[PDB]
Design a protein around this ligand. Structure first.
Ligand SMILES: O=P(O)(O)O[C@@H]1[C@@H](OP(=O)(O)O)[C@H](OP(=O)(O)O)[C@H](O)[C@H](OP(=O)(O)O)[C@H]1OP(=O)(O)O
Ligand SMILES: Nc1ncnc2c1ncn2[C@@H]1O[C@H](COP(=O)(O)OP(=O)(O)OP(=O)(O)O)[C@@H](O)[C@H]1O
Ligand SMILES: [Mg+2]
Ligand SMILES: [Mg+2]
Ligand SMILES: [Zn+2]
Ligand SMILES: [Zn+2]
Length: 421
């Protein structure tokens, strides 16, 4: 028996909606789809099963077993889904919700959990960061001038601000964060606090308390003092907002730079081609999650510019041989062989379709890693004496048909930014 009153609205990115249970530390993830065309009921089941099979097989090998969690696909009563949707409709921010299938993913609620223990903890603080792409493209295939010296995030800011999506430009550059420089990382996190956008959220015990009275720097610092300056009897005591936010920013930097005891044979060893600094504003440990995420982003070896020629070869082949879309395993299954196909890092274009297809798939995987989120969970545990857990969220492979749009959008981002100067 599923009561609709127990589940609350948790969040919503443009492709899926999440709801969280108040009692158990789990969440349910429902898909969004366009009116043209809404997917069939048995196709939804396979889509969700591919998201699990991608995270299970591909991303656990690239990032680590401890850092990825992708719970099972589950079936629910339609009457529960209809009623839960209507309640939650109210709380949406404003692509139609999956109301007719009754299929969803049951994931653990990482806002209330530690990974290494894996029970609920309280009091528990959680910082969810969306870091974006951590390098500037370096291939000779790129035409435009600005792309070699400014990262896509900073270039995308200006368009988003002018569009009206955001009010002001952020001072956050991903390359400050991904560079192992503590000083740059600290600055990157402070700017990201000052202008959150969709790139930062903070929770206390499951409840959102920061990045969408908005509100608010002082009010945040109230919730953080018990974690960072714990009064063990004595309240000594008077800590200003500046000092509280500082201890947050240090701890998050210290956490992202931490790695497990393991420093295993790197799945990816791709070197960092500069610029390591960005013209928008002023190494990283091999074991840590932030580095491993950067490496899977670097499967975009040739830029989008770039890869669109390689995409065109695979499309003219499937124009003429449409039956081979399935036989080539373009839409999975994302199994142990599929992970092996991604490890060919060679960049010569003599082999023509076998090579292009391999690179198209590597690019789909990179686009996933650029758009992924990182969750950090601070809390006391028996196994300040704060214990941490790192995790990655939002790991669903970007669809094959979005590659045209990715070219089209990047062309618009740089041309507006170059016109602006
Ligand atoms: O359009 P882009 O390249 O800026 O990236 C999209 C994001 O834009 P933003 O973070 O606002 O700059 C976009 O963010 P918002 O929906 O605007 O929060 C999504 O993360 C989207 O991912 P998905 O394809 O829905 O999984 C992202 O789409 P993909 O490009 O990853 O397909
Ligand atoms: N396992 C989880 N634990 C805690 N919070 C979660 C979990 N899964 C999802 N969320 C929250 O739900 C939000 C929205 O879900 P999600 O990002 O997965 O959907 P999306 O449409 O694919 O997003 P995006 O547009 O960023 O690609 C996330 O930003 C995250 O804060
Ligand atoms: Mg998505
Ligand atoms: Mg997300
Ligand atoms: Zn930048
Ligand atoms: Zn514990």
């Amino acid at each position: 028996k599923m009561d609709e009153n127990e589940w609350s609205y948790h969040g919503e990115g443009n492709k899926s909606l999440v709801v969280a249970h108040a009692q158990r530390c789990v969440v349910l993830r429902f898909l969004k789809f366009p009116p043209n065309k809404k997917k069939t009921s048995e196709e939804i089941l396979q889509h969700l099963q591919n998201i699990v099979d991608f995270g299970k097989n591909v991303m656990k090998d690239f990032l680590g077993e401890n850092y990825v969690h992708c719970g099972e696909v589950v079936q629910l009563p339609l009457e529960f889904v209809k009623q839960l949707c209507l309640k939650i409709q109210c709380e949406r921010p404003e692509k139609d919700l999956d109301t007719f299938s009754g299929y969803a993913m049951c994931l653990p609620n990482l806002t209330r959990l530690q990974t290494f223990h894996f029970a609920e903890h309280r009091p528990i603080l959680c910082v969810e960061i969306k870091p974006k792409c951590g390098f500037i493209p370096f291939s000779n295939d790129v035409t435009h001038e600005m792309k070699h010296k400014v990262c896509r995030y900073c270039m995308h800011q200006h368009l988003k601000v002018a569009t009206g999506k955001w009010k002001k430009i952020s001072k956050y550059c991903p390359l400050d964060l991904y560079s192992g420089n503590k000083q740059r990382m600290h600055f990157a996190l402070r700017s990201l606090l000052q202008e959150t956008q969709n790139n930062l959220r903070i929770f206390k015990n499951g409840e959102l308390i920061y990045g969408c009275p908005v509100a608010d720097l002082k009010e945040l610092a109230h919730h953080l003092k018990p974690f960072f300056f714990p009064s063990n009897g004595l309240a000594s005591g008077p800590h200003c907002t500046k000092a509280v936010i500082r201890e947050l920013v240090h701890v998050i930097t210290r956490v992202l730079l931490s790695s497990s005891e393991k420093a295993r044979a790197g799945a990816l060893r791709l070197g960092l081609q500069g610029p390591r600094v960005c013209e928008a504003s002023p190494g990283l440990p091999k074991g840590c999650l932030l580095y491993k995420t950067l490496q899977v982003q670097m499967l975009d070896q040739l830029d989008i510019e770039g890869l669109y020629p390689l995409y065109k070869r695979v499309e003219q082949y499937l124009e003429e041989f449409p039956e081979e879309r399935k036989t080539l395993q373009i839409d999975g299954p994302y199994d142990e062989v599929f992970y092996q196909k991604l490890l060919d890092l060679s960049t010569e274009d003599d082999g023509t379709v076998a090579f292009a297809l391999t690179k198209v798939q590597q690019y789909r995987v990179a686009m996933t890693a650029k758009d992924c989120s990182i969750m950090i969970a601070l809390s006391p545990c028996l196994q300040s004496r704060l214990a941490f857990s790192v995790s990655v969220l939002d790991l669903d492979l970007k669809p094959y048909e979005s590659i045209p749009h990715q070219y089209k959008l990047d062309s618009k981002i740089v041309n507006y930014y170059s016109k602006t100067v």
